[PDB]
Amino acid sequence: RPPQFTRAQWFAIQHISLNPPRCTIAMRAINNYRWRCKNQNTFLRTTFANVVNVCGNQSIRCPHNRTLNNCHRSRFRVPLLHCDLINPGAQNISNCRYADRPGRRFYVVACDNRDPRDSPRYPVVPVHLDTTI
């Protein structure tokens, strides 16, 4: 991750967007902080506070990290936009192109204690998007 962000701030930048534009546009906001195009990314059409409250759901195994059990699944399906990189040979970020796949799915996040740079308003925060279902 970019060192200027905590895990939660970088989670919010990648994964929280209520009304994202098309993927090729929406992804520039993320890739501008990277040296290379992110291969896949899901935008959850929700708010950070909403995801923080999902961190309070019962602790479950993370489907994409099966040695971890600090994951939390949403009780409802939420609208999302998934973006897949069409040109993974891209050598820089200037011309990343993405395919769009809108959907409505449950999401699963890993949550952990906040970083000291994070707002004291949320002592526990999402730090990774594990999967959607």
Curated annotation (Swiss-Prot):
<dbReference type="GO" id="GO:0035578">
    <property type="term" value="C:azurophil granule lumen"/>
</dbReference>
<feature type="site" description="May be involved in LPS-binding">
    <location>
        <position position="33"/>
    </location>
</feature>
<feature type="site" description="May be involved in LPS- and LTA-binding">
    <location>
        <position position="35"/>
    </location>
</feature>
<feature type="region of interest" description="Required for nearly all of the bactericidal activity; partially involved in LPS-binding and bacterial membrane depolarization">
    <location>
        <begin position="1"/>
        <end position="45"/>
    </location>
</feature>
<comment type="function">
    <text>Cytotoxin and helminthotoxin with low-efficiency ribonuclease activity. Possesses a wide variety of biological activities. Exhibits antibacterial activity, including cytoplasmic membrane depolarization of preferentially Gram-negative, but also Gram-positive strains. Promotes E.coli outer membrane detachment, alteration of the overall cell shape and partial loss of cell content.</text>
</comment>
<dbReference type="GO" id="GO:0005576">
    <property type="term" value="C:extracellular region"/>
</dbReference>
<feature type="active site" description="Proton donor">
    <location>
        <position position="128"/>
    </location>
</feature>
<keyword id="KW-0044">Antibiotic</keyword>
<feature type="modified residue" description="3'-nitrotyrosine">
    <location>
        <position position="33"/>
    </location>
</feature>
<comment type="similarity">
    <text>Belongs to the pancreatic ribonuclease family.</text>
</comment>
<dbReference type="GO" id="GO:0006935">
    <property type="term" value="P:chemotaxis"/>
</dbReference>
<feature type="disulfide bond">
    <location>
        <begin position="37"/>
        <end position="96"/>
    </location>
</feature>
<dbReference type="GO" id="GO:0001530">
    <property type="term" value="F:lipopolysaccharide binding"/>
</dbReference>
<feature type="glycosylation site" description="N-linked (GlcNAc...) asparagine">
    <location>
        <position position="92"/>
    </location>
</feature>
<dbReference type="GO" id="GO:0019731">
    <property type="term" value="P:antibacterial humoral response"/>
</dbReference>
<dbReference type="GO" id="GO:0004519">
    <property type="term" value="F:endonuclease activity"/>
</dbReference>
<dbReference type="GO" id="GO:0003676">
    <property type="term" value="F:nucleic acid binding"/>
</dbReference>
<feature type="binding site">
    <location>
        <begin position="38"/>
        <end position="42"/>
    </location>
    <ligand>
        <name>substrate</name>
    </ligand>
</feature>
<keyword id="KW-0325">Glycoprotein</keyword>
<feature type="active site" description="Proton acceptor">
    <location>
        <position position="15"/>
    </location>
</feature>
<keyword id="KW-0929">Antimicrobial</keyword>
<feature type="glycosylation site" description="N-linked (GlcNAc...) asparagine">
    <location>
        <position position="57"/>
    </location>
</feature>
<keyword id="KW-0732">Signal</keyword>
<dbReference type="GO" id="GO:0050830">
    <property type="term" value="P:defense response to Gram-positive bacterium"/>
</dbReference>
<keyword id="KW-0540">Nuclease</keyword>
<dbReference type="GO" id="GO:0043152">
    <property type="term" value="P:induction of bacterial agglutination"/>
</dbReference>
<feature type="disulfide bond">
    <location>
        <begin position="55"/>
        <end position="111"/>
    </location>
</feature>
<dbReference type="GO" id="GO:0045087">
    <property type="term" value="P:innate immune response"/>
</dbReference>
<keyword id="KW-0944">Nitration</keyword>
<keyword id="KW-0964">Secreted</keyword>
<comment type="subunit">
    <text>Interacts with bacterial lipopolysaccharide (LPS) and lipoteichoic acid (LTA). In vitro interacts with and insert into lipid bilayers composed of dioleoyl phosphatidylcholine and dioleoyl phosphatidylglycerol. In vitro, tends to form amyloid-like aggregates at pH 3, but not at pH 5, nor 7.</text>
</comment>
<feature type="disulfide bond">
    <location>
        <begin position="62"/>
        <end position="71"/>
    </location>
</feature>
<keyword id="KW-0255">Endonuclease</keyword>
<dbReference type="GO" id="GO:0061844">
    <property type="term" value="P:antimicrobial humoral immune response mediated by antimicrobial peptide"/>
</dbReference>
<feature type="disulfide bond">
    <location>
        <begin position="23"/>
        <end position="83"/>
    </location>
</feature>
<dbReference type="GO" id="GO:0050829">
    <property type="term" value="P:defense response to Gram-negative bacterium"/>
</dbReference>
<keyword id="KW-1015">Disulfide bond</keyword>
<dbReference type="GO" id="GO:0005615">
    <property type="term" value="C:extracellular space"/>
</dbReference>
<protein>
    <recommendedName>
        <fullName>Eosinophil cationic protein</fullName>
        <ecNumber>3.1.27.-</ecNumber>
    </recommendedName>
</protein>
<dbReference type="GO" id="GO:0004540">
    <property type="term" value="F:RNA nuclease activity"/>
</dbReference>
<keyword id="KW-0378">Hydrolase</keyword>
<dbReference type="GO" id="GO:0006401">
    <property type="term" value="P:RNA catabolic process"/>
</dbReference>
